[PDB]
Design a protein around this ligand. Structure first.
Ligand SMILES: CNC(=O)c1cc2c(N[C@H](c3ccc4c(c3)S(=O)(=O)CCC4)C(C)C)ncnc2[nH]1
Length: 167
């Protein structure tokens, strides 16, 4: 968990302008969070990038999990192997507001992080999931009580988030 170059926002929330895939390779954290969907189909975005970095081993493991346990619920999670990226991957489903899912489930989604002492994570429900990224950061700060290192792969969004938080 040798995270470097993060800006500490609160006692337990740190943030960096970085690609989560590159952070996972450098740090090899105990837990990396995936921004998953309920069927664990890692077809693009953050989930697609993490799967590609495991040379599709994450997708094969995920399909086997789904066959045995069924889909996740929005706001839920499951712990699977981290493969070459981390000891474990915590697949968390945040709401996709562009598909009509309830923004209130973003609190339930971040609550899953509290079962792990230290995590490397993306900003849940941001990008094409349609949530307001400044609201996502506020929910993270208000809900996560363990140590979370957020990697946001966009300098423009990183600067807006830091400015909004320090207001
Ligand atoms: C090669 N790496 C990547 O493509 C990559 C993208 C990437 C990344 N993207 C951010 C992001 C955060 C949350 C979600 C999305 C996107 S999504 O559009 O995939 C839908 C799921 C939720 C945006 C906002 C900057 N944050 C952190 N490391 C990264 N790595």
């Amino acid at each position: 968990n040798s995270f470097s170059g993060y800006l500490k926002l609160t006692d337990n929330v740190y943030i960096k302008n970085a690609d989560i895939v590159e952070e996972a390779k450098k740090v090899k954290p105990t837990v990396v969070v995936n921004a998953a969907n309920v069927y664990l189909k890692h077809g693009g975005g953050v989930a697609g990038a993490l799967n590609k970095a495991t040379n599709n081993a994450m997708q094969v493991e995920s399909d086997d999990y789904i066959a045995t346990n069924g889909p996740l619920k929005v706001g839920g999670s499951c712990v699977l192997s981290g493969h070459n990226l981390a000891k474990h991957c915590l697949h968390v489903v945040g709401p996709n507001v562009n598909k009509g899912e309830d923004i209130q489930l973003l609190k339930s989604a971040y609550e899953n992080f509290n079962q792990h002492e230290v995590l490397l994570a993306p900003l849940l429900s941001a990008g094409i999931f349609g949530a307001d990224p400044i609201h996502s950061l506020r929910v993270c700060v208000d809900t996560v009580r363990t140590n979370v290192y957020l990697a946001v792969f966009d300098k423009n969004l990183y600067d807006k988030l830091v400015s909004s938080f320090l207001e």
